Amino acid sequence: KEKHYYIGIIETTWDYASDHGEKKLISVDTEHSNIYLQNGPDRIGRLYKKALYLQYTDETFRTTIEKPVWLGFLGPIIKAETGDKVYVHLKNLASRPYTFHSHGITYYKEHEGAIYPDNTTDFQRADDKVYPGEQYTYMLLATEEQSPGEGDGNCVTRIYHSHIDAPKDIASGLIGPLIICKKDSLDKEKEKHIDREFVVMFSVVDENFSWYLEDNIKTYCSEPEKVDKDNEDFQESNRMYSVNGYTFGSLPGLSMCAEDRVKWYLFGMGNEVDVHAAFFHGQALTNKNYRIDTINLFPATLFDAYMVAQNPGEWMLSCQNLNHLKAGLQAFFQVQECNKSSSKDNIRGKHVRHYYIAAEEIIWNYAPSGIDIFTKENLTAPGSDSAVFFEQGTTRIGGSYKKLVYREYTDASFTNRKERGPEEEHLGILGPVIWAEVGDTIRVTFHNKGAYPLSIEPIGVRFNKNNEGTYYSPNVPPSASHVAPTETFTYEWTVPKEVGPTNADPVCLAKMYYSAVDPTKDIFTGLIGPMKICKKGSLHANGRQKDVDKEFYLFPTVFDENESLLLEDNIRMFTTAPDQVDKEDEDFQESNKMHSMNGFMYGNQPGLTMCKGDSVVWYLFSAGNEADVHGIYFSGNTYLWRGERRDTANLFPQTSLTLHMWPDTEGTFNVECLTTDHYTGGMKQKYTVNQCRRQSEDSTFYLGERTYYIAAVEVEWDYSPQREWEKELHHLQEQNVSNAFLDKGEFYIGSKYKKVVYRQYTDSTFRVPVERKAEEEHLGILGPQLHADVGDKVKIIFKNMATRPYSIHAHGVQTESSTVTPTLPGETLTYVWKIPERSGAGTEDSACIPWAYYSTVDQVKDLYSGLIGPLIVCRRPYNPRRKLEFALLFLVFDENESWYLDDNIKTYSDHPEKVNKDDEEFIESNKMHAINGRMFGNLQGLTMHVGDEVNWYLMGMGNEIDLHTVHFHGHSFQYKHRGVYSSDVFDIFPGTYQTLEMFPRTPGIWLLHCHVTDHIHAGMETTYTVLQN
Ligand SMILES: *[C@@H]1O[C@H](CO)[C@@H](O)[C@H](O)[C@H]1NC(C)=O
Ligand SMILES: *[C@@H]1O[C@H](CO)[C@@H](O)[C@H](O)[C@H]1NC(C)=O
Ligand SMILES: [Ca+2]
Ligand SMILES: [Cu+2]
Ligand SMILES: [Cu+2]
Ligand SMILES: [Cu+2]
Ligand SMILES: [Cu+2]
Ligand SMILES: [Cu+2]
Ligand SMILES: [Cu+2]
Ligand code: NA
Ligand SMILES: [O]
């Protein structure tokens, strides 16, 4: 059908915590809220003016249609079913220009609502700048191409926002939800067997970026003269950590019944600090028929989830990013009894597993050997990167910290202690494994031999209010939420089918438990452990999975000892001058950020050993804050996850993953974090795979043979050869702005740096480089796109025409040795990459998948210096439509880490003498936020036709900062085998390699960008062109 909405943009005053109390939130004392909510002489408080979308009954925009209270400031909910034509009648009643741009629906250029250089004419531009008092009516068509995929639910979450300066428009308040549904799955604007629909935007809503900042300062700050917009504390006080714009618990309206079938539409929004971990303390959810609880959201991440509300009472919805939790990213919801009126599991007291766990103080050395196992270098080597963390002296703790750690004892006295064996040598700091099967009951007798009160909070199991490990509320014998320094308490959790693995899940799921009297300090103090929840009849009496040789539990995180309950205690036991230590000095706190796996650093983790051919399950999980974006890479072997083949697992606060691996080659390999600073900081370990059988000789499995001649060449690389697109963008936006990254001013470098890049040659003489033709113009900085099929042996003849050692190696591929030999300058070496079945698609991948190739001599610096490329591995050779391929690398090139920094100062700075490599402004000037090493629409060659199929190969690498939410204007993509899932933003992080299918249908020049604020603004964007057929 054809549907009409009337949406006005008005200016209005918005309250971020409309009272009314009195609350206790997790990890938030009753005074902390003042930071953000307290009006003052130099602080705005909790009221702000902003621009919001409202719904109207009528073309005479006078009577509003009120929204549900839980929506907050979000625009009104728009819905559509496949086949529907939606007309959005916008009227702008604010003081400045805005638009309506919608994410998951098809439109011509007249109806995109976004301004940018696309060669359009006046009649396709009226949509892109709706002036005050002006009115524009947008035509949207819900096509099949944009429909939810066969593997999605009936409805998916999409958004709409203003898109002049989207970041600032959205910060100002113009963001709302657009729910797209299959036909005929809707009945009277609600989905057919769903009782409740809620939408929840998680975001650090940043009023510093609003168009109304100055109006707000002028209005509320009783001393406007004394405000410094760039003072860091003032900025914090305007960062409103919110769900739907509600802070500190004040989200009202989230009420439901026991039994109710609920659909949640979640999204993230904002900047680099918007690393969220949405958590329903409830409460168990499914996403895509998989059990989850936690969901991670980033700027523009679109997600949906299904919940049969159960376990009646007052619950918390929160962000488990500990920095967020403690700034109040928390909303209550309630499940009331109405009464039942259903039934089900039932199982309580039948199969009982009984654990006895104590909390106790130890001195944990994060690196017992005292050396870095990968380099054999002494950790305190003056000048080394490890020295920052392991140096000990007048104002510096070192490698070893007093911690609190869970440990297992034999029975209900605490006389004895279950000694750890070989199977648990790798656990390290982690507490004992809690394991249960669906249908079991779990009792945990917890005893506290520490000096602070503690608890145990499990993720992934069922527990009533009497057993909850955290305390919170909307309005001393020990309890679930509080076991004090000498006391003891026995928790009861259940594991019913509705909280355990579904048919689509694997046999066991990775979960975790931690103390949560204050989880923002307890975890880092050391109170974290692994859990494993499995299907009925899948484990042995001893806890081991039936047909599985090995099971490992990995918890990588940044152990922020600055947040440890034992910090002061540690300062007084380890520094040789305790009084001179400033607990606020940046350098000091870096020295206490311990980047580690199971509390181990610099290759010192023991006990990851296994036989070749072994069946191995890896249980990964993490915790922490925004710094915790991890890409755990298993060199030398791949794994399956949800039928996808990968070798690098992405993890965020409270993320957990179950990986299946069959290691296929003898050696000692690395398990390490790809994320640049984590690696440098010591997040790297070995795992050994031994030979325990024969030993055949050769299985003659070379269906295919290829050879490629590639060189590293030093080249002058320009991140922005032209500036016309940028000038036009900023002109269209009316922005007085200038460019930190590209403007030389007095002495900065600019857009051109000497780099080293891979390039293809025609033969072994290396004297004729291969012509890059039209369909490879888009590669930019990337090395050539190499192809291989499963079955192939790929010879890489590699010449180093550069001036220091380098190599070339690919993710995914199998080689004979775990070490990669460096190629010296002038040398040519041969590397052989075998492509067995495990180097290619899993059963649920598309036919072609991408893997990064890169140099291993110094993985951080060689990368930032320019050496990176895509290897595409395809399945099995065995109609009219043209198939295209594009590889895209989303990476912030950090020129401060290039081997060529010094040269680039001497060559490109007008006054090199005045450069200080350690100055924060110079540092920023060399962080080049690029796509394939080009910015601001300087990446050409993304050109295609209506009717084509396009495989996009998205790749991510880099640092903590390198979260990238890749978004294509005008079109959606599908992914997975047979295009089963569907969306228009894909999350990309370091180590994330994904293939997306696109079937372009709408002619136009369309914007392609990362949706993270700082990244758009720094030019991480280009356009792609769709031509008529
Ligand atoms: C826009 O127009 C110019 C001038 O006609 C053309 O040469 C240029 O390639 C166009 N831009 C794109 C992205 O197609
Ligand atoms: C590292 O060097 C110091 C002296 O510079 C020495 O005392 C220490 O034992 C060394 N560590 C190891 C593990 O060899
Ligand atoms: Ca337009
Ligand atoms: Cu958007
Ligand atoms: Cu968050
Ligand atoms: Cu990491
Ligand atoms: Cu980005
Ligand atoms: Cu868009
Ligand atoms: Cu956009
Ligand atoms: Na404030
Ligand atoms: O979009």
Numbering used by the authors: 1 to 475, 483 to 885, 890 to 1040
From the article:
Human ceruloplasmin (Cp) is a multi-functional copper-containing protein. Indeed, Cp oxidizes highly toxic ferrous ions to the ferric state for further incorporation into apo-transferrins, catalyzes Cu(I) oxidation and promotes the oxidation of biogenic amines (norepinephrine, serotonin) and synthetic amines (p-phenylenediamine (p-PD), o-dianisidine(o-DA)). The Cp molecule (∼132 kDa) consists of a single polypeptide chain with 1046 amino acid residues.
A re-refined structure of Cp at 2.6 Å was employed for construction of models, elucidation of additional details of the structural organization of Cp, and for comparative analysis. However, it was not possible to unambiguously trace the majority of interdomain linking regions most likely because of their inherent flexibility (these linkers have thus not been included in the present model). Domains 2, 4, and 6 contained one type I copper each. Three copper ions (two type III and one type II) form a trinuclear cluster with ligands provided by domains 1 and 6. The S-S bridge between Cys881 and Cys885 is not the only factor that stabilizes the interdomain loop 885–893, but the end of this loop is additionally stabilized via H-bonds of Arg893 with Asp959 based on the our Cp structure. The H-bond network links two different β-sheets, but also restricts the loop end movements in case of proteolysis that results in cleavage of the bond next to Arg893. Another binding site was located in domain 4 of Cp near the side chain of Trp669. This binding site in the Cp molecule includes amino acid residues His667 and Trp669 and also Ser622, as demonstrated in the present work.
